From a paper:
BPSL1038 is a protein with 88 amino acids encoded by a gene annotated as hypothetical in B. pseudomallei. The overall structure folded into a modified βαββαβα ferredoxin fold similar to known Cas2 nucleases. Functional analysis revealed that BPSL1038 is a nuclease with endonuclease activity towards double-stranded DNA. An active site with a unique D11(X20)SST motif was identified and proposed for BPSL1038 and its orthologs.
The crystal structure of recombinant BPSL1038 (rBPSL1038) protein (~12 kDa) was determined by the single wavelength anomalous (SAD) dispersion method using the SeMet-BPSL1038 protein. In the absence of a characterized homolog for BPSL1038 in the Protein Data Bank (PDB), the structure of BPSL1038 was determined via experimental phasing using the SAD method with the Se-Met substituted protein crystals diffracting to 1.88 Å resolution. The SeMet-BPSL1038 (smBPSL0138) and native BPSL1038 (rBPSL1038) crystals diffracted to 1.88 Å and 1.55 Å resolution, respectively. Both crystals belong to space group C2221 with similar unit cells. The crystal structure revealed that the asymmetric unit comprises of two molecules of BPSL1038 that form a homodimeric structure. The homodimeric structure of smBPSL0138 and rBPSL1038 show that both structures are almost identical with a root mean square deviation (r.m.s.d) of 0.15 Å over 187 Cα atoms.
Numbering used by the authors:
A (entry chain A): -13 to 87
B (entry chain B): 2 to 87
Amino acid sequence: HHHHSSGLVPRGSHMAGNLVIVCRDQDADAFDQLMQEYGSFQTRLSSTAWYLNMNIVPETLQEDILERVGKYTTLYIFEATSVTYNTIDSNAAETLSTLFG
Amino acid sequence: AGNLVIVCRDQDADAFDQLMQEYGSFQTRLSSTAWYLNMNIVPETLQEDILERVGKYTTLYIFEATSVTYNTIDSNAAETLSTLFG
Ligand code: NA
Ligand code: NA
């Protein structure tokens, strides 16, 4: 079973807010430093994209990030309602089912 | 339509971007490894399509999005999101 999907459901330890944060390549390392502050509630999907399970209004996260990295920084924050994904890595798959619900 | 965010690993960036071209003005590239797509497509169908063309061991994530907030230097992304997202 390498194909998976989740409706990112709030119930139990899965918070209601499901966010996808994307930056530009040039800011990858700075966004990662910042995302690590959210602990086990985020995971890095690529050098420039993260998933965050947290009850935070997107515009508020945006103001927070711009205050730290600078107001001329490019970023995109989406509220997600589902995820469909594929991985070949057994270790990444268990992290992800847990993080996604 | 539906609002999708597609993310791959850095190793696959060139292959994904070639493939995302078929969606024309309905997609915009946000970074090397992330795209926004405005299209009426089932996410598992998009996923099966991608895996058939890039390889079945490829890592990918497809999110259905219900809102976006952004600040950007990329004129194509600003225009595509502000016009198509809703
Ligand atoms: Na939220
Ligand atoms: Na096809």
